[PDB]
Amino acid sequence: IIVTTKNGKVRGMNLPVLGGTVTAFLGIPYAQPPLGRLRFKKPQSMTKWPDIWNATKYANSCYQNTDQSFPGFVGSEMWNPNTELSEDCLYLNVWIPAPKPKNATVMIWIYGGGFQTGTSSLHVYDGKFLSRVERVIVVSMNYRVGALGFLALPGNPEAPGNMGLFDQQLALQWVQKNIAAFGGNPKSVTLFGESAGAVSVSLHLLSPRSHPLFARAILQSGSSNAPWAVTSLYEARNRTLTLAKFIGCSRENETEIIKCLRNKDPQEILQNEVFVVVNFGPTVDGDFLTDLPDTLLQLGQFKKTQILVGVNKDEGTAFLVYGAPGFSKDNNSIITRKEFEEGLKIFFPGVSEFGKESILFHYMDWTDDQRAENYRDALDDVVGDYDIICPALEFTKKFSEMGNNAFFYYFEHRSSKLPWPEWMGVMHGYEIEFVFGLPLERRANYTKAEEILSRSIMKRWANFAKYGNPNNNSTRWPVFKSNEQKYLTLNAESPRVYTKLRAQQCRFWTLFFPKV
Ligand SMILES: *[C@@H]1O[C@H](CO[C@@H]2O[C@@H](C)[C@@H](O)[C@@H](O)[C@@H]2O)[C@@H](O[C@@H]2O[C@H](CO)[C@@H](O[C@@H]3O[C@H](CO)[C@@H](O)[C@H](O[C@H]4O[C@H](CO)[C@@H](O)[C@H](O)[C@@H]4O)[C@@H]3O)[C@H](O)[C@H]2NC(C)=O)[C@H](O)[C@H]1NC(C)=O
Ligand SMILES: *[C@@H]1O[C@H](CO)[C@@H](O)[C@H](O)[C@H]1NC(C)=O
Ligand SMILES: *[C@@H]1O[C@H](CO)[C@@H](O)[C@H](O)[C@H]1NC(C)=O
Ligand SMILES: *[C@@H]1O[C@H](CO)[C@@H](O)[C@H](O)[C@H]1NC(C)=O
């Protein structure tokens, strides 16, 4: 099982997957290690090796602070890295079906994590089931996060900004030059990702030099037009200078502020990263991204192709348990009105006190919901609608006004193995295990219905990658058009077709709230 690339030969391994076999290549380098003078710089093309690269084990994860908000709790630690942390982390993984195909569709996964955390070696990102069941080739790459991936000085090639996004772009370039040798069709590539990875996929749609590197796109719970996605270039010069003051590298000569940072330790950078305020994420760098995503969308400046977008029913709950008063994973988080208004101050830092009164009126005082859970559920809807759902709906509507086919889903199933409490519902991030087919292993002790639901989701995802349409006697997933705006619910009982998701709420965020 040796495949010959353009930089050398790589060895793989065969995995027993669901009574069959899947060939996996874990840890193929796609760029020179960004060590020394290459730190904070854009990735350089990988050098050649005459030997055989073994690629039989998940490579290193990029340096990142780990989540320690809930010690020992699996619901938080399942997202922490599971390999050694090092700056030498620019590697990718490939999963080829067995027997080897000849022109298989390729699906490339881009993990999320607020552009500060994440790795492709997580168990929930294991592509072997998807390659087995749907006979697609699955690719995933590690890209730099935090300051080491998004430290920005305007126009300074020592730290230009969006380095982590260029890491993804170079990994897409590797697929165009090498996936044919593995049995994949370089003209049938689909990008899919979740949260910050969905922001990444939607930024590749807005980056012209990425257009020829893929065919279609899938956005799970994220889009680059979200309020938290992209900063301006001056906003990114600040924070970069603020970090320099905290770490002790303040210079009046800018290009040598980076020479001081290149000689600090990676753990030293991570400890001062958090004191700056997404502290180091995508910016309008003028190279990868030339304008704010909302401007590029209004100008029609994006790749014209099909997209598949969707959100989960309870997007906001995961946000609230990490920094909102009254919320806890150890009780029902029944909050008072005072705690509600303090939650708005956290998630709406600059808005006025009348702006917060507008939110409270449209989500609470406009109706008669006198349940004890009113303020709690409404604050989940406020954060979910403002930060995830309504931006994703606006992204899909823009692609539809221009005449591109789009498909929208509404995930409603809560995993029977969800470790978080019940008040959090269908959380941000917990559709991924159904997309990657984890309920198919009967030893994982998912319900039989969850295995069926997972096979359905994997089929719809793979159909969209292969044919540009997720759809047969099953419930048809209609096209999302700008007028009717039909979407499909994803659940274990019976998927339903509805129209205009959260329409009243999104009309408040896009038509009325900007005016207060
Ligand atoms: C759900 O849980 C949250 C989180 O609380 C934490 O988990 C709980 C399961 C429980 O173990 C808690 O003890 C634990 O902190 C609850 O929200 C927290 O509520 C507590 C009070 O119950 C708040 O702590 C208090 O805050 C005040 C500062 O504004 C201050 O007056 C208090 O200190 C005084 O009183 C204590 C006695 O409690 C005394 O020891 C001190 O010396 C002092 O006099 C006290 O620190 C937390 O700030 C709250 N947390 C947040 C994030 O807001 C929540 O109430 C609970 N909900 C339900 C419905 O049960
Ligand atoms: C690569 O894998 C082969 C086959 O298992 C093994 O013989 C070899 O030792 C490995 N290479 C290294 C450097 O360990
Ligand atoms: C794969 O399909 C593309 C069109 O999608 C075609 O141009 C190409 O020749 C095919 N390659 C192989 C190896 O079958
Ligand atoms: C970043 O911006 C804040 C707000 O204007 C300012 O006070 C601070 O000095 C800036 N940080 C710099 C220039 O390092």
| Tokens linked to 111 | 């993990």
Structural domain count of the chain:
1
Q: Is 428 a catalytic residue?
A: yes
Pairing of strands 486-490, 497-499: antiparallel
Length of the chain: 516
Determine the Cα–Cα distance for residues 75 and 432; give it in Å rounded to an integer. Answer: 14
Cα(425)–Cα(375) distance, integer angstroms: 15
Please calculate the CA angle 404-407-412 and round it to the nearest 5 degrees.
Answer: 160
Q: Which residue has the tokens 């790795």?
A: 119
Domain housing 452: 2-322+380-507
What is the C-alpha separation between 258 and 245, in angstroms, rounded?
Answer: 12
| Cβ atoms < 10 Å from Cβ of 15 | 17
Q: Roughly what angle, to the nearest 10 degrees, separates helices 163-182 and 196-204?
A: 80
Q: Give CA–CA dist 339/379, Å, rounded.
A: 10
Q: Are 57 and 27 in contact (CB under 8 A)?
A: yes
Q: What is the CATH number of the domain that holds 402?
A: 3.40.50.1820
Residues 392 and 259: their CA atoms lie apart, in Å, by 40
What's phi and psi for 244, nearest 5 deg?
A: -60, -40
Question: 24: which strand partners?
Answer: 13, 95
Burial class (CB in 10 A: 0-12, 13-18, 19+), 43: buried
Report the first-to-last Cα separation within the chain, whole angstroms.
63
Give the method used: X-ray
In a domain, 347, yes or no: no
Task: Judge contact between 10 and 3, C-beta under 8 A.
Answer: yes
Which residue owns the Cα nearest ligand 2 atom 10? 54
Inside any domain, residue 352? no
In a domain, 204, yes or no: yes
Residue keyed to tokens 């030893």: 443
Ligand 3, atom 5: nearest CA belongs to which residue? 187
> Cα–Cα distance between 252 and 50 in angstroms, integer?
45
Does residue 105 sit in helix, strand or coil?
strand
Residue 279: inside a domain, yes or no?
yes
The DSSP result for 468-492, as a single string, is SS----SPP-----TTT-EEEEE-S
Peptide bond into 99 cis (omega under 30): yes
Q: Is residue 336 part of a domain?
A: no
| Residues 262 and 254 sit within 8 Å (Cβ to Cβ) | no
Assigned token pair, 217: 């796109």
Atom of ligand 4 nearest to the CA of 244: 14
Q: Are 139 and 241 in contact (CB under 8 A)?
A: no
Residues contacting ligand 3 via CB (< 6 Å): 102-103, 185, 187-188
* Atom 12 in ligand 2: residue holding the nearest Cα: 54
Q: Alpha carbon 251 to chain centroid distance?
A: 35
User: SS3 of 268, please?
Assistant: helix
Is 150 within 8 Å of 280 (Cβ atoms)? yes
3-state secondary structure of 499: strand
Judge contact between 31 and 167, C-beta under 8 A.
yes
Whole-angstrom distance, CA of residue 377 vs CA of residue 385: 12
CA-nearest of 3, 414, 465 to 189 is 465
User: How many helices, marked H, and strands, marked E, lie in the chain?
Assistant: 17, 14
Burial of 232 (0-12, 13-18, 19+ CB in 10 A): exposed
Find tokens 């996605």 and name the residue: 229
Alpha helices, H only, 361-479: 374-384, 390-401, 432-435, 448-467
The two tokens of residue 93 are 């993984």
Alpha-carbon distance 395 to 461, whole Å? Answer: 19
Q: Would 78 be classed as within a structural domain?
A: yes
Q: Which residues contact 386 (CB under 8 A, 6 or more apart)?
A: 227, 347, 509
Protein residue closest via CA to atom 14 of ligand 2: 54
Q: Is 87 a catalytic residue?
A: no
| Strand bridging mode 216-220 / 307-312 | parallel
Say if 354 falls within a structural domain. no
List the structure tokens of 339. 């705690």
Q: Is the CB of 242 inside a 6 Å radius of any atom of ligand 4? A: yes
Cβ neighbours of 80 (radius 10 Å): 17
Best of 238, 252, 272 for a ligand 4 pocket test (most atoms within 8 Å of beta carbon)? 238
3-state secondary structure 125-165: HCCHHHHHHHCCEEEEECCCCCHHHHCECCCCCCCECCHHH
Question: What is the residue whose two structure tokens read 């020179």?
Answer: 32
H or E element in which residue 266 lies: helix 266-273
DSSP 19: T
330 Cα nearest atom in ligand 1: 9
Beta-carbon contacts of 281 under 8 Å, excluding residues fewer than 6 positions away, are: 114, 115, 116, 150, 196, 229, 230, 231
- Alpha-carbon distance 227 to 386, whole Å? 8
Q: Whose CA is nearest to atom 1 of ligand 2?
A: 54
Tokens of 135: 């006979």
Task: Specify the residue for token string 């939110």.
Answer: 359
Confirm if 39 and 262 have CB atoms less than 8 A apart: yes
Sheet holding 2-4, edge to edge: 2-4, 9-11, 52-53
Q: Is 27 helix (H, G, I), strand (E, B) or coil?
A: strand
426 token code pair? 């269908």
- Please report, for residues 133, 315, 437, 515, the alpha-carbon distance to residue 430 in angstroms, rounded to integers and kept in the order given: 20, 10, 12, 35
Q: Which residues contact 304 (CB under 8 A, 6 or more apart)?
A: 402, 403, 404
Kindly report the backbone phi and psi dihedral angles of residue 492, in degrees, each rounded to the nearest multiple of 5, phi listed first. Answer: -85, -10
- DSSP-derived secondary structure for 319-333: HHTTT-TT--TTS--
Q: Return the residue matching tokens 């080829």.
A: 96
Strand partners, 56: 26
Round the CA-based radius of gyration of the chain to a whole number and report it: 22
CA angle 437, 220, 167 (to 5 degrees): 95
Residues 385 and 388: their CA atoms lie apart, in Å, by 6
463 in a structural domain: yes
> One of 315, 394, 450, 451 is an active-site residue; which one?
315
Task: Write the DSSP assignment of 274-332 as a string of letters.
Answer: GGG---S--B--SSS--S-HHHHHHTT-S--S-EEEEEETB-SHHHHTTT-TT--TTS-
Q: Does residue 421's CB lie within 6 angstroms of at least one atom of ligand 1?
A: no
- Measured distance CA(481)–CA(157) in Å, rounded: 42
Handedness of CA 239, 244, 250, 256 (dihedral sign): negative
Could you tell me if 186 and 174 are in contact, meaning their C-beta atoms sit under 8 angstroms apart?
Answer: no
Best CA proximity match to 274, nearest among 235, 303, 242: 242
E strand or H helix at 174: helix 163-182
CB count in 10 Å sphere of residue 169: 21
Please indicate whether residue 268 is annotated as part of the active site.
no
Residue whose structure tokens are 């569709």:
105
HSE of 368, CA atoms in CB hemisphere, 13 A: 0
Main-chain phi, psi angles of 266, to 5 degrees: -60, -40
Contacts of 384 (CB under 8 A, 6+ apart): 311, 314, 315, 316, 317
